[PDB]
Each structure stands twice: as structure tokens, then as C-alpha cells.
Amino acid sequence: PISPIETVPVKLKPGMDGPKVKQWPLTEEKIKALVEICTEMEKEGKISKIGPENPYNTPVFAIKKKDSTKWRKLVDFRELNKRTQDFWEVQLGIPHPAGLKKKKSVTVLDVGDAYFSVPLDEDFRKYTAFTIPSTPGIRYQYNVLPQGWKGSPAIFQSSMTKILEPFRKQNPDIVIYQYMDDLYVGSDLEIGQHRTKIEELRQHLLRWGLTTPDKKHQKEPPFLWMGYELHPDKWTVQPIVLPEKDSWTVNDICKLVGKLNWASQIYPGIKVRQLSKLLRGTKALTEVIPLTEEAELELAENREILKEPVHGVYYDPSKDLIAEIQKQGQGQWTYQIYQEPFKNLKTGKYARMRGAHTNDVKQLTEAVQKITTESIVIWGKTPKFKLPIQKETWETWWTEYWQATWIPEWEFVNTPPLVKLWYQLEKEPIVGAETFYVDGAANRETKLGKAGYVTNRGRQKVVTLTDTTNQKTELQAIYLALQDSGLEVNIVTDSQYALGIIQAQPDQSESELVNQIIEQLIKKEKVYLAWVPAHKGIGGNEQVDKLVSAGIR
Amino acid sequence: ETVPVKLKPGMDGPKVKQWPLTEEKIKALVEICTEMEKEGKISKIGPENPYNTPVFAIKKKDSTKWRKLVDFRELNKRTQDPHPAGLKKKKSVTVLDVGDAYFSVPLDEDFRKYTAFTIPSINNETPGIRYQYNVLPQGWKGSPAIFQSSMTKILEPFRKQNPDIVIYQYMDDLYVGSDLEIGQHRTKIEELRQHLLRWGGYELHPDKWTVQPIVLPEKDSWTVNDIQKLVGKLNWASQIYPGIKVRQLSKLLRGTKALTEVIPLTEEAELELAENREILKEPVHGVYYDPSKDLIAEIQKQGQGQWTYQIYQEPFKNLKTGKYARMRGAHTNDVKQLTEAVQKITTESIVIWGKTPKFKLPIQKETWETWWTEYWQATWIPEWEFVNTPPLVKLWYQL
DNA sequence: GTCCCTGTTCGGGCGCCC
DNA sequence: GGGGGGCGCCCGAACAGGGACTGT
């Protein structure tokens, strides 16, 4: 039937008007699909025949459902969507099985024909005019929420929430995970009393016009829910079938990364760096891309991972939340969250590269941050951490990074590869290290530049560069000095730019040149990098400025 | 009957996404809100209201009392638009939370939709629950304004009787300054609180707030590196103090020398360094506070629980430069310390200029947003932006 | 002023759910 | 085959903002 719930007042964006769009042509199979649906809906007052007093129209179609026996009537409302007001979406995320607590009794219910059970605002109904092509063609409008309209999900989700409020306040200790029209219902009653509470919920929903067909009323484990199978003590993801082509387009790559991402929530060790690099630049989905040797190999490892059997467990709040992170290389991380060892709640990965230049301690801090926020969403609290980084390492980094950085409660885990700082600038100038004054100049017109140094022991070198920039020459000069210096070196630069990068101790960079520089910094015993104001006559910055300036500036 | 209020012309309402909340904070928010709903102060709304403002909750001090906090910064920036110089000079100032007062006033019906907010659920068990205000919401800049007339009538008697007590209001806050011994003061405040109970953050001491001067090293031996570091620091300071000179000191760096070579200071450079030492201790010239401009606060991590900051409205025109010391311990938490620092600074700013600064925070955006509400204790919230500070400026302000 | 470099946001694909 | 909202993931196109540069 149709809920006696009050409609939600909607309106078009100011100065706009309803869609006028030709019904495009449909399959025979689909026209009879539609007609059967529309004669039934019309009978039930869910749609109304309209006349010529309705200028509007919007194309309709249908697709088979997951049942493959039933059709879903859809409406391409993309134009009405454009001209409809904004809603605030009330769905803030996706519930996750790992966040469920053990319940003695469980039920899963799906509301039947959910949207069509919720009234649409009368004032707005006319913009939903459509036409079934066929005897001639029939013109209807919607009295209930239509599928393809942008207001329908929020309005349904909000209505469902009003409807369950009273049952929730009366039954505070029945837990009801409410996702669209899908209900997970859990309790700590004996199955006898539980079944009775379910009936009371079902009657409650039926009083507000929402039916719950026995066909989608799961009573025994394992429950199918949100893409999982919930067993009484463990949960599982429904099988993830990877594609298997030999040519790969941008589109089926994007499709493979997605299934992998989805997979990583419970499959430890999933990696997709090498695969998503492929997607760079490529201008269209149809475009084909050849698997790099590394991507090739990565896809294999993932395939082996997916072959194993795996599961998660439910949340026990009387216990601690533990997050364990593992370094994976390439700016790739994996984590398993658990309470009791070797019984994961869930897993995940972190690979986001943010920054032209970064290092592993930064990246680890980003991983911890993401994991924390995710734990707060799922369990409502921060987890305790097990990280592959020595307390001394983190300490060093923290007392020398000029930024506020912090990790919650953690404890070290000898499982390699450990995270570390790969070199360390000196805080004092070095005795018996040669002093390099470096500098660069670039001509903005010609793009020609020079980079070079001058040392206190009387060496000088100038390298000429083409198609370059000021920043680039400053970086080139520092590199040059690292190349021609010993295991210990003092470098004086006038470039804040260059100084800011190196001082943050990167071990990876987008920049070829910065990477070469990093390679050198790791080989050294001691580096000390100092700054002076440029063009302020400070020798021997002065000396090297003259060198690289000549014929450039 | 309500005061009609409108947004600034050509400006729409706030549309800011609610962030994830801890279970503790959510349970508190749901408890507080169902009660506020019982009292008519808020109403459930639907999703046809397109506006949103984030909300969370702070457990003040040692108590078991949560206070709801609505991040109204966006709305305040979009709402339509003298200060007691003596307040900064009292030996004690107490900060009273007079938020509840605002619930006594209805809120213009056509404005209510802009005060929408949404309560999240743990693990998304339910869609968010949306609400709307029917009274003057705390945190909104319109609240103290509209309640101004009524607020004056309340204090008027207490002021007459205590003309040496300065009472100042900012948003949900009442600053009360006295030169009383700390005993008669606290008795005075409790008097004023009795006086407020009748008609429906301690303790400050602005008389010991500190200016942090730029300072120059003192040494017996100077190396090339020392002098280089000095010359660069003075170069920069000479943008704040035109009087700074560098010629003689820079003379010692003629040639191209080892960083660790010792360089004896000439007589000239010796003197020009002494002069500079004093030029640094003077009022910076031509610094006029302009109420129409925002206060910019800038903070640098100095390490070891040491944080420096400056407040200016235009570059090198510092209205105040200060320091903030904390525990040099093991359980140091930078983010906590940093949010305690922004709260001290905002506080000084309200007390000195009656305004909130805009902060340039030396923290990663994501790091900050993950944790700052775990350490927040104010009823207001300053604007801010994030900034990877040049590690140069870190050196300029060091002590 | 201009050019360079870096960081943010935001929109567009795909994954998953109903 | 064509629709919607949510969250996730990646990418690159706009921007914003600060430092360095020019100059008969």
C-alpha cells in the first residue's frame, strides 16, 4: 500500500520549470514489463493518468532485478534533477559488519516496493509526467517516490527514520541497522521472544504502509546483508570475481581497482599502486593500456591473495581495539584491526600519495590518521596501534619536524620492513667538512640557466642547463655539490625553496632531480645545510652568484 | 515577537558536512538534543532543508557535563553584520558561560532553516538525524546582538553597584574583570552568578600577559656560520624595524670561508650589533589596530613545548608577539598543545581587541581535523587555515 | 606586475549497497 | 544499453598563495 506519512515539501530551483523530454523508444519486452507495472500501480493509486494540461514528460525504462524475475521501473530524470532544489543528504556512510556486536537473535527484512510506498508532494507531482508507449500510448504522473529522481533517496531515508523512531524509543534494546529499506534486526532475547518483537516491528511498519514480504525475511544464518554473509560468530564478503582479459582498457582497469579496493576490507595485503599508475594521462575509458611488467606482477599477487579463504569477527566492546600497520613499499600500507590476535575485525590499505616530496614517517602518520577516523566511524573510538617504527625513530622525527605531528597510543612491532629516516641533516656545521656555496640562475625568456658552487678550498664548478627554472637550478646546484663533495659536506644555499624540501627529509619524490639528491643524502655521513639571504653581498655566496649569473642575468 | 534577520546580500546558507563523532560525544549530543527538543528549543527537520552546520560536544574540565557546540563559523561569516580597553588591565578576569540565556528568545522564523545540523550514528546504524533552532542558538553571532538590549537590563543593577568591575560580552561569553584580591573577586563573581540565576573557564590575569621580543645571541666566539645566521636574522628583522643595520657584520664575511672558522668581531661590527640589540627593543612604529580587518595569528613550533606566535593585520606590523610554554615531557602531544595555544591566543585577542583572530596553523590539515575537538574547551571557534611554515621563520622568533 | 611550484577542492570515471 | 543517493578509490583541471625575478 501507500504510507499515511506526510509528504516532504519540495520545489524546483527558482525561475525554472518541469522537464519537456521526448520518450525515447523501448524494447517490446520492456513495454510489456512497464505496462504490467503501470496498470498495477495505477490501480493502487501510486500513479495517475494525466491529460493535455500536463506539458511535461521524462523518458522511462526498465532493467531486470537481481531476482532476474522482476523488473525495475526507472525514470531518466536527469533534467528534472537539474532543476530540482538541493537536499541535505542524511545518509552519512555505509554500515560495516565489523562494527556489529554479537546478538543472540538476528533477523533481516527487506521492505517490499519501498519507494512506491512513500507519497510524493502533491504540488510537485506534475513534473514527474511520463508516457508508456505501446492501442495507443498512456500518460501518467507519480503519486509516490520515483526511481531516478534525486530527491527520492533522502526523502525515503528520512521517512523511514521517522517511521522507526517510535518503535526505537519503545524498544531501545532492539538494534535496527537501517539501510534504505533494508533492516538488520538484532536482540539478546531467546529466539521465541525475538520472533515476537519482529512481528511487532513488522506490524509497526505495516501500520505506516510498509510491507515486509516473507520472501525477503531471513530467519536463519547465514544472513545476506549489505554484500556480506553474517554467520553467528563470523562474517564474510560475498565472492569477489576478478575480470581476466588479456587486453585491458582504462574502464576494466578502473573496474579491477574497484573490486580490489572493495576486497581489501577483509583480504590483507591487497595492492593497487602499479595498477592505478596505468590510469595516468589516459584520455578515455575505451582507451586500451598494456600491463606494465610491475602491474602485471602486482595483479598476480592479488590474485593469489583472493584465492585464500577469509573472514572477520564481530565487535566486543568490553575489549580493546588494536590496529596493526605493515609497510608495503611504494607508499603502500596495509592494516589489520583486531581485538584478539589472528581474529581480524577488518583490514584495509592506505596508498594515497600527497606531496611532491615525502617520506615514510609522514606516510605512516597519514595512515594512522585515516585509520583513526575510520575507527571512529565504525566503532566510535580510536584503536590502540602496533606500528613498525621504533620509538626512537619517531622521537627524532618529532623533535626536528617544524610542524605539529602526533600519533595516538602505540607500541612498536619488529615485523619488517621497519619505517625509518634514511638520513639526517646536522644541526651544527661540520668541522673538517669542506664548505660549498651553491647557487643557480635562470633566464625566464630563453629558459637557459647555470648552476654551480664555490668552495672554501678554492674549487669552483659551473654547469649549464637548458629548459630550466630558478628553483630547478637551485636544486641542481645542491646536487652538484653533493656529487663533488666527500662523505661530509657543509652546503650554504640562498634558496628557501630548496632548503624547505631537503630539511623535511624526503626519501621519495615526484621529481627525478630530488630523487637523485636524496640518493646522495643517503650515501653521506654528515650533511649540514645552511641558508643565507641572496644578493646581500655575503661571500662566498657573493662569489658563486657572480659565476652562475654571468650570461644569464 | 522576533527580530527579523537576513543573510549578507548575495550569500546563501551554510552547507558544511558533519564530521565523524565519538560514541561518547554522540550519546551526549542525543541526550542533550532530545531534551532541547522537549523544551521547544529545537525541532526535527527533513532533507528538503538544504543547509547544514557541523556539531559536536565538549566535556568541560573534570565534570560529567557535556556542552553542545555548533560550528557556526560559516553561518556567522554569512549573517548580516565600543570595546573596554580597561578589561586587559584588571588583575583578575573570570569567564562566565552565559549561553543558556539565548534560549529564552525566539528566533526569526525565516532564519531558522540556516541553523540546521545533523547528528551521526555509530557505524551508520541510521541515517543522520536533522534539527533546526527555534530560539537563539549559542555560537551564533546574531545571538549576543539580539539579546544585547535584554543583557544590559540584567547587568545594569550589578554594574551601578560595582563600577570598578568591568563586564564584557563576546558571543556565549561574559568576561568580568576586577582588581579585587582573589577572594573578594571570586565572591563577587558568585554574586553576579546569583544575580543571573534570578533572571533566567576561570581564571584570567591580563596583567601578566607577556610580549616576546626578538633577541640576538650573545657569544664570546663567533664563527662564520654564527655570523651568517645572525646576518640573515637581522636582514629579516629589518623589515619589522627599519633601524636594523647589517653592513659591518656582513663585512666579516668577505671572501669565501669555512663555516666553522672563528671570526673576531671588529670594533664597528661590535657596536652595530649592540645598537641592533636595542633597536630590537622598541615599539614597532605605525601599528594601528583596524577593526574592519581580520586579526591574523601565526604560530610556530619552537620545540620542547615552546610555541611562538604573532598577531598582525598587515605583514611586519605586529600588534603583539608572544610565547607559550608547556611541559617538556614524555607524554607531549603537539596537537593538544597547539589547540591549547590557539585557545590562549584567541582569548587574549577577545580580551584585547574584542575580536577573534584568523589562525595560520603549522599542522597538516588532516592531522588537525582528526584530533582538535578532543582538546577544545571554548564556546567559540576561530577561523583558521593550514600552512607549512618556512623553517626560516621558525628561527627568527626562537628564544 | 610574471612565472614557478605546491597544495586544495572538486568533478569525473570505476567499486560496493539499496 | 540509458536513472538516483550514499561511502570508498584514483586521477587531473581549476584554483589559491607565496617566493624570485626586472631594470636602456
Ligand SMILES: Nc1nc(=O)n([C@H]2CS[C@@H](COP(=O)(O)OP(=O)(O)OP(=O)(O)O)O2)cc1F
Ligand atoms: N539500483 C537501485 N536503484 C534504486 O533507486 N533503488 C532504490 C529504489 S527501491 C529501493 C529498495 O531497493 P529494492 O531492490 O528493495 O526495491 P523494492 O522497490 O523495495 O523491491 P522489492 O519489492 O523489495 O523486490 O532502493 C534500489 C536499487 F537497487
Ligand SMILES: [Mg+2]
Ligand atoms: Mg525492497
